[PDB]
Amino acid sequence: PEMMPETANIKLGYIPIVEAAPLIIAQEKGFFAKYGMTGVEVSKQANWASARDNVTIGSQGGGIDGGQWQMPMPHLITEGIITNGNKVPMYVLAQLITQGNGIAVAPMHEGKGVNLDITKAADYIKGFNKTNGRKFKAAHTFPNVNQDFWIRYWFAAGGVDPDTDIDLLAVPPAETVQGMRNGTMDAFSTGDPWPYRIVTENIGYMAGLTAQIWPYHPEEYLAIRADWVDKNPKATKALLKGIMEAQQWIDDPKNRPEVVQIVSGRNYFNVPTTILESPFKGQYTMGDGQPAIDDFQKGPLYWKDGIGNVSYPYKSHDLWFLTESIRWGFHKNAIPDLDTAQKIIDKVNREDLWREAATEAGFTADIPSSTSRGVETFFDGITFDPANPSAYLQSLAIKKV
Ligand SMILES: [Ca+2]
């Protein structure tokens, strides 16, 4: 009775990328059912804009109650920043995964130094219009969120202003790939399974994995509408527990072949298992004369990483996402300062529910002791101290603040 979800039903959206694994596995391996959530519908979203629209309308309107998200979408939706003023409060409940993302670059840029650190290739990229007829063109999967941040950080770390020196745009994943094939797209912030296909099919090479840019960086999260969570507190915790067990299950190498088999299935990603087998072993052919990566720790991780617990949603990570938003001058009026960012974070991040669910499920030993993971370090030496985001912003060379 006390654990009995108020409802066993919920519609959770997902995008066909490795970040969705916990949702798919929690469902397919019976982890959701174990806790009473036998009516979970893991619904594939056409794209991020559609996922946003669907959670804004909610399940009662034919959309979704929550699901998988790039950060800080839950916060932006809560504030109605990306919903034309339609504020739909949401709660960030857990981080689904870390890594499993990367930046692909067109083959025409090989031997140019456009790798992890593009410093020496900065002028080349900056003068691409002069030398090649068009501004260097890069793409992400939705503005102002994860992929946009990853590619922006990467560019900026090397001296390339992503807003002024290049054409950074949101472009469908397929179109972008086709663009690189055609010779019109120069790079794109992607993630698995897209990277394997790009290298294998000689479409391009991997300049770097986000695992290299920011080891064990916060990635995508499970977030559900606040009205749903408020009305169904027990069901919410049941979902969290199913997710946690799924994440733990996925991280055991012995289960990864099955994980790959399931998510690649027709009813989910619908892709050849061969393209995900490597990444789930932490194996990536990088290309451009760079050594291949063969490290489980650099592949996608869903439960524990080299720093702490992956699933626990650290508020310090929400803070980085909003701080980086401020860095690029995103939502100038809605999030004009760090204090406002923090206020939004305290309304959105429900790490307390993760703690409670983990405790009830018997994962007390895995619960981080703090809402902050501490000072974060990027591949270029820049550090983000959650206690002083202002210092972080001021340490950055390229920014709009
Ligand atoms: Ca991603």
Side-chain angles (χ1 to χ4, degrees), residues 17-19 48 68-70 97 99-102 141 146-147 150 189-192 210 217 219-220:
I17 49 180
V18 299
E19 291 88 322
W48 286 117
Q68 172 200 340
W69 309 93
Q70 281 186 267
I97 179 187
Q99 314 185 325
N101 284 255
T141 61
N146 293 46
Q147 313 319 115
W150 304 152
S189 195
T190 188
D192 307 326
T210 52
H217 65 276
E219 184 45 32
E220 290 185 33

Coordinates of all heavy atoms in Angstrom, one line a residue, residues 17-19 48 68-70 97 99-102 141 146-147 150 189-192 210 217 219-220, ligand 1:
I17 N 18.9 7.4 -28.7 CA 20.4 7.5 -28.5 C 20.7 6.8 -27.2 O 19.8 6.5 -26.4 CB 20.8 9.0 -28.4 CG1 19.9 9.7 -27.4 CG2 20.8 9.6 -29.7 CD1 20.3 11.2 -27.2
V18 N 21.9 6.4 -27.0 CA 22.3 5.6 -25.8 C 21.8 6.2 -24.4 O 21.7 5.5 -23.5 CB 23.8 5.4 -25.7 CG1 24.2 4.5 -26.9 CG2 24.6 6.7 -25.6
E19 N 21.6 7.5 -24.4 CA 21.1 8.2 -23.2 C 19.8 7.6 -22.7 O 19.4 7.7 -21.5 CB 21.0 9.7 -23.4 CG 22.3 10.4 -23.5 CD 22.8 10.5 -25.0 OE1 22.6 9.5 -25.7 OE2 23.3 11.5 -25.4
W48 N 14.0 16.7 -30.4 CA 13.9 17.5 -29.2 C 12.8 18.5 -29.1 O 12.2 18.7 -28.1 CB 15.3 18.1 -28.9 CG 16.3 17.1 -28.5 CD1 17.4 16.7 -29.1 CD2 16.1 16.2 -27.3 NE1 18.0 15.7 -28.4 CE2 17.3 15.4 -27.3 CE3 15.2 16.1 -26.3 CZ2 17.5 14.4 -26.3 CZ3 15.4 15.2 -25.2 CH2 16.5 14.4 -25.3
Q68 N 13.3 11.6 -21.0 CA 14.7 11.9 -21.2 C 14.9 13.3 -21.7 O 14.2 13.7 -22.6 CB 15.2 10.9 -22.2 CG 16.6 11.1 -22.7 CD 16.9 10.3 -24.0 OE1 16.1 9.4 -24.3 NE2 17.9 10.7 -24.8
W69 N 15.9 14.0 -21.1 CA 16.1 15.4 -21.6 C 17.5 15.8 -21.5 O 18.3 15.3 -20.8 CB 15.4 16.4 -20.6 CG 14.0 16.1 -20.5 CD1 13.4 15.3 -19.5 CD2 12.9 16.4 -21.4 NE1 12.0 15.2 -19.7 CE2 11.7 15.8 -20.9 CE3 12.8 17.1 -22.6 CZ2 10.5 16.0 -21.5 CZ3 11.6 17.3 -23.2 CH2 10.5 16.7 -22.7
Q70 N 17.8 16.8 -22.4 CA 19.2 17.4 -22.5 C 18.9 18.5 -21.5 O 17.8 19.0 -21.4 CB 19.5 18.0 -23.8 CG 19.9 17.0 -24.9 CD 20.3 17.6 -26.1 OE1 19.5 17.8 -27.1 NE2 21.6 18.0 -26.2
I97 N 22.7 9.1 -17.6 CA 24.0 8.6 -18.1 C 25.0 9.7 -18.2 O 24.7 10.9 -18.0 CB 23.7 8.1 -19.6 CG1 25.0 7.6 -20.2 CG2 23.2 9.3 -20.4 CD1 24.8 7.2 -21.7
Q99 N 28.7 10.7 -20.6 CA 29.4 10.3 -21.8 C 28.6 9.7 -22.9 O 27.3 9.9 -22.9 CB 30.6 9.5 -21.4 CG 31.3 10.1 -20.2 CD 32.6 9.3 -19.8 OE1 32.7 8.1 -19.9 NE2 33.5 10.1 -19.3
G100 N 29.2 9.0 -23.8 CA 28.4 8.4 -24.9 C 28.1 9.4 -25.9 O 27.3 9.2 -26.8
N101 N 28.8 10.6 -25.9 CA 28.6 11.7 -26.8 C 30.0 12.1 -27.4 O 31.0 11.8 -26.8 CB 28.0 12.8 -26.0 CG 26.5 12.6 -25.8 OD1 25.7 13.2 -26.5 ND2 26.2 11.8 -24.9
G102 N 29.9 12.8 -28.5 CA 31.2 13.2 -29.2 C 30.9 14.2 -30.3 O 29.8 14.5 -30.7
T141 N 21.8 19.2 -31.8 CA 20.4 18.7 -31.9 C 19.3 19.5 -31.3 O 18.1 19.1 -31.4 CB 20.4 17.3 -31.3 OG1 20.7 17.4 -29.9 CG2 21.4 16.4 -32.0
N146 N 22.8 20.5 -23.8 CA 23.9 19.7 -23.9 C 24.8 19.7 -25.2 O 25.9 20.4 -25.1 CB 23.5 18.2 -23.7 CG 23.1 17.9 -22.3 OD1 22.3 18.7 -21.7 ND2 23.6 16.9 -21.7
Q147 N 24.4 19.1 -26.3 CA 25.1 19.1 -27.5 C 25.6 20.5 -27.9 O 26.8 20.6 -28.4 CB 24.4 18.5 -28.6 CG 23.7 17.2 -28.3 CD 24.6 16.3 -27.4 OE1 24.2 16.0 -26.2 NE2 25.7 15.8 -27.9
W150 N 28.5 21.3 -25.5 CA 29.7 20.5 -25.8 C 30.5 21.1 -26.9 O 31.7 21.3 -26.8 CB 29.3 19.1 -26.0 CG 28.5 18.4 -25.0 CD1 27.6 17.3 -25.1 CD2 28.5 18.7 -23.6 NE1 27.1 17.0 -23.9 CE2 27.6 17.8 -22.9 CE3 29.2 19.6 -22.8 CZ2 27.3 17.8 -21.6 CZ3 28.9 19.6 -21.4 CH2 28.0 18.7 -20.8
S189 N 27.9 18.1 -33.1 CA 27.9 17.6 -31.7 C 26.9 16.5 -31.7 O 25.7 16.7 -31.7 CB 27.4 18.7 -30.8 OG 27.7 18.4 -29.4
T190 N 27.4 15.3 -31.6 CA 26.6 14.1 -31.6 C 26.9 13.1 -30.5 O 27.6 13.5 -29.5 CB 26.8 13.3 -33.0 OG1 25.8 12.3 -33.0 CG2 28.2 12.8 -33.1
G191 N 26.3 11.9 -30.6 CA 26.5 10.9 -29.5 C 26.1 9.6 -30.1 O 25.5 9.5 -31.2
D192 N 26.4 8.5 -29.4 CA 26.1 7.2 -29.8 C 24.6 6.9 -30.0 O 23.8 7.3 -29.3 CB 26.7 6.2 -28.9 CG 28.2 6.4 -28.7 OD1 28.9 6.9 -29.7 OD2 28.7 6.2 -27.6
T210 N 32.9 13.6 -25.6 CA 32.7 14.5 -24.5 C 33.4 13.9 -23.3 O 33.7 14.6 -22.3 CB 31.2 14.6 -24.2 OG1 30.6 13.3 -24.1 CG2 30.5 15.3 -25.3
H217 N 31.1 13.9 -17.3 CA 30.3 15.1 -17.3 C 28.8 14.7 -17.1 O 28.4 13.7 -17.5 CB 30.5 15.8 -18.6 CG 30.0 15.1 -19.8 ND1 30.7 14.1 -20.4 CD2 28.7 15.1 -20.4 CE1 30.0 13.5 -21.4 NE2 28.8 14.1 -21.4
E219 N 25.2 14.5 -18.2 CA 24.7 14.4 -19.6 C 23.2 14.6 -19.6 O 22.7 15.7 -19.3 CB 25.1 13.1 -20.2 CG 24.7 12.9 -21.7 CD 25.0 14.2 -22.5 OE1 26.0 14.9 -22.2 OE2 24.3 14.4 -23.5
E220 N 22.4 13.5 -20.0 CA 21.0 13.6 -20.1 C 20.3 13.1 -18.8 O 20.8 12.2 -18.1 CB 20.5 13.0 -21.4 CG 21.0 13.8 -22.5 CD 20.4 13.4 -23.9 OE1 19.3 12.9 -24.0 OE2 21.2 13.6 -24.9
Ligands
CA1 CA 23.4 13.8 -25.5

